[PDB]
Amino acid sequence: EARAALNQALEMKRQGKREKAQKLFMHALKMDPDFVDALTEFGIFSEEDKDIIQADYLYTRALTISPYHEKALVNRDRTLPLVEEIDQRYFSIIDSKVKKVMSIPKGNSALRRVMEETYYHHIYHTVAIEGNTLTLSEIRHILETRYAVPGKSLEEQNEVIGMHAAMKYINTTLVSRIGSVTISDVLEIHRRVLGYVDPVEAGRFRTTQVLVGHHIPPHPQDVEKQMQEFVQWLNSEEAMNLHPVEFAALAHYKLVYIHPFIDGNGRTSRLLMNLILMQAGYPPITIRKEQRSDYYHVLEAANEGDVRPFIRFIAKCTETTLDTLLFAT
Amino acid sequence: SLEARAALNQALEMKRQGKREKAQKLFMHALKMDPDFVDALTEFGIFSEEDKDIIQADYLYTRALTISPYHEKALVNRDRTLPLVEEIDQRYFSIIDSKVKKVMSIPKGNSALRRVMEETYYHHIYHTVAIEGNTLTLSEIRHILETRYAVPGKSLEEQNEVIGMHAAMKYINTTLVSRIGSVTISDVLEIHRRVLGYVDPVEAGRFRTTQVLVGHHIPPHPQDVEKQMQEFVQWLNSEEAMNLHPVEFAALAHYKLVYIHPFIDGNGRTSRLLMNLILMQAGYPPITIRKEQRSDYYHVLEAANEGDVRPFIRFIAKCTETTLDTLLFATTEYSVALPE
Ligand SMILES: Nc1ncnc2c1ncn2[C@@H]1O[C@H](COP(=O)(O)OP(=O)(O)OP(=O)(O)O)[C@@H](O)[C@H]1O
Ligand SMILES: Nc1ncnc2c1ncn2[C@@H]1O[C@H](COP(=O)(O)OP(=O)(O)OP(=O)(O)O)[C@@H](O)[C@H]1O
């Protein structure tokens, strides 16, 4: 019961429980996730395994519940600047790999092959996370030939066509264009993303209220005003001062939070993310299909107070993209 | 100008000696060299009445007078045939009206009618997409709409045309048919938005921005298209249009939209749908311009552009009859062949 599982895990730490300590710490927070002592003690336990980022999260969560909790505050005050350095140090590692892909001359036969294949790779994964059953070979066939695939839903194949049209529009019209991003530009991306599936709802705002896991987004009445504030933030001086990868990740989150469409919210958000990156001089990033579980958890964590685990998750995806380019080239 | 005044005379002397088929071919060749040859129209009009073809004869005389108003030989013939054709045409609408009453006489929930009304829905889709060069079969179009799975080795654009139509008819049958009040420019765009939405979601429900050729027809410039549609919907809701016979009003509404050609694509499909909305609002079943009538469908549209729209109005009335003939036949066929 309450305050029971922690002590079991805490005495196990003295013994050297190893996995047995962790399992009980996880079970203790399963019964009560707002148990301030279980967070602080599991935070201390995390630093023993050199996991300072996880520890800082647990302390920050504990203080959001109990601001004046001494044991958590004295630990956070130490880790707060330490993590800020670790995070900034990770962005500088990414910035060096981004410079190493720009160092490669345009016209390289190796890069052309990768940039081509990774375009289809991005489409496969962005549709696969939302439960599209089409393979990479099938998605290649759809876009190359424009003939339908045997024994597969027309809705699934129109999702693929919708994405290709949306990226073509971005890469052509938006990426290079001078000036601010408008509410019109966001609708125009969605109009292509969902146009071939639902031509009625494509490029028009959500009219009904919906549940997204455990997230209840703004009411259709408010959605319009939420988007006017969102585009104002995108063009704000504050947002320009942020590191591209962070600004991209925050732009992503704020759109999936507002959830202004009946469908294509995740897809439009992942596209808008890449527009921010490509406008700042970063290649298009792919949140892979197998990262669906993680992708949601960091979005859950973002809703409850701390957005950083999401910002880090995007930066990790950014690195794996850059790693794939430099390797394949 | 006597390039084919020898071809007329050639055909005319052939008529005297008999030369039934030989006369026609030369009359057709005479109008091929000069289609605005007033004597070739009037003489071929006289020739037509000999085969009891008064409708064709009246067309030729009316065409001749549009070129040469005061041409005596044509005028004396037209003055006779003008009221005669008006009677023949009105008599055809009364034949249709009796067959429309005979489909309403059939009970509301008849099991035989339900089967036909279902099959003819897919039949209408097959033909409306087939005329514009869609290669999908009837069985394939049934599979698309029933299962919502794609067809092997056929373009996604062709299959999205089928989905676009089904959505457009569903919207019409549900929202528009039963709705009280006037038809608006918004309603026309909303039909097109579904018709073309699954193929071209960008241009769906938005007016033509560029100028295009349609066979030998140059439609109003994109600048004027908006005003042409405001006058079109004003005519649709006008008292004059309500006084016209449903089949004529349907056919004229069809023509005026394909004339204006206010979209990049889906002009014919939107027109054929709007036609059926007029008919169904007046209490007529949805009519199908079949795929094999593509050649005829264009000729009567050409004929309409040059002055006389009646051949089109008659072409729609003929399609209306063949629809009603198919329903009454199949319904009586199934009544015996099905249980109940
Ligand atoms: N708890 C959450 N809070 C906020 N956003 C979330 C949450 N879980 C998932 N999301 C985001 O919203 C999407 C889920 O929305 P939903 O399930 O309605 O749409 P989908 O069909 O999965 O994808 P799409 O929005 O691309 O059509 C995810 O793809 C993700 O980007
Ligand atoms: N000479 C003509 N004058 C007026 N309208 C014509 C003429 N020829 C064809 N049309 C109309 O235009 C339609 C064909 O237009 P067009 O060839 O641009 O489109 P499509 O792709 O064949 O068909 P849709 O309009 O259904 O997409 C015909 O169905 C008819 O309604």
Numbering used by the authors:
A (entry chain A): 105 to 433
B (entry chain B): 103 to 442
Excerpt from the paper describing this PDB structure:
A single ER‐localised Fic protein, FICD (HYPE), catalyses both AMPylation and deAMPylation of BiP.
Dimeric wild‐type FICD binds ATP (without magnesium) in an AMPylation‐incompetent mode. (i) The wild‐type dimer FICD structure displays a lack of density corresponding to a Mg2+ ion. As noted in other Fic AMPylases, this Mg2+ was coordinated by the α‐ and β‐phosphates of ATP/AMPPNP and Asp367 of the Fic motif (Xiao et al, 2010; Bunney et al, 2014; Khater & Mohanty, 2015b). The only possible candidate for Mg2+ in this structure was a water density, located between all three phosphates, that fell in the Fic motif's anion hole—a position incompatible with Mg2+ coordination (Zheng et al, 2017). Moreover, the position of the ATP α‐phosphate precludes in‐line nucleophilic attack (by the hydroxyl group of BiP's Thr518) due to the proximity of the Fic domain flap residue Val316. (i) The mode of ATP binding in wild‐type dimeric FICD sterically occludes the nucleophilic attack required for AMPylation.
